[PDB]
Amino acid sequence: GDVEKGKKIFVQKCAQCHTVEKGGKHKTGPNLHGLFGRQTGQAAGFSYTDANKNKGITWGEDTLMEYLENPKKYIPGTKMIFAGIKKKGERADLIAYLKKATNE
Ligand code: HEC
């Protein structure tokens, strides 16, 4: 994926609810640092729905590709109010950005 294109997507569609940096604040949504290779619902200090807390999957490229297409379909009951990114290539670019920015 294209990290620069992914950053733009993140800024436009995600940043208002999410920070990525280590120690970043929670906003409407949880800070995302450390997301890759961890189960759903594990950001310290964030109050998740039971739906996100108990989804029982590990985040990675494949599960983020599915989730970001349509969050409510993957996690019914989620309080992330976002319809999804419909284009597969845009999801891949965003995910490549996230794999860098949430791991720095
Ligand atoms: C505010 C309106 C949001 C927007 C825009 C985005 N997200 Fe979000 N996200 C939000 C909330 C409130 C939550 C918790 C939902 C719950 O039911 O408890 C989330 C959750 C996620 C997660 C899961 C995190 C985890 O399990 O630890 C991910 C991976 C995620 N959000 C990513 C993400 C992306 C990449 C966004 C832009 C496309 C995006 N979110 C937008 C709130 C909001």
Author numbering: 1 to 104
Authors' account:
Cytochrome c (Cytc) is a small, 104 amino acid, essential protein with a covalently linked heme group that performs vital functions in both life-sustaining and cell death pathways. Apart from respiration, Cytc plays a key role in intrinsic apoptosis, where its release from the IMS into the cytosol allows Cytc to bind apoptosis protease activating factor-1 (Apaf-1), activating the apoptosome, which in turn activates caspase-9 and the downstream caspase cascade. Using purified protein and cellular double knockout models, we show that K39 acetylation and acetylmimetic K39Q replacement increases cytochrome c oxidase (COX) activity and ROS scavenging while inhibiting apoptosis via decreased binding to Apaf-1, caspase cleavage and activity, and cardiolipin peroxidase activity.
It is worth noticing that Cytc purified from ischemic muscle exists as a mixture of acetylated and unacetylated protein, while acetylmimetic K39Q Cytc mimics 100% acetylation. The maximal oxygen consumption rates using recombinant K39Q and K39E proteins were increased by 38% and 72%, respectively, compared to recombinant WT protein. In line with this, the cell line expressing acetylmimetic K39Q Cytc showed reduced levels of Cytc pulled down after Apaf-1 immunoprecipitation compared to the cell line expressing the WT.
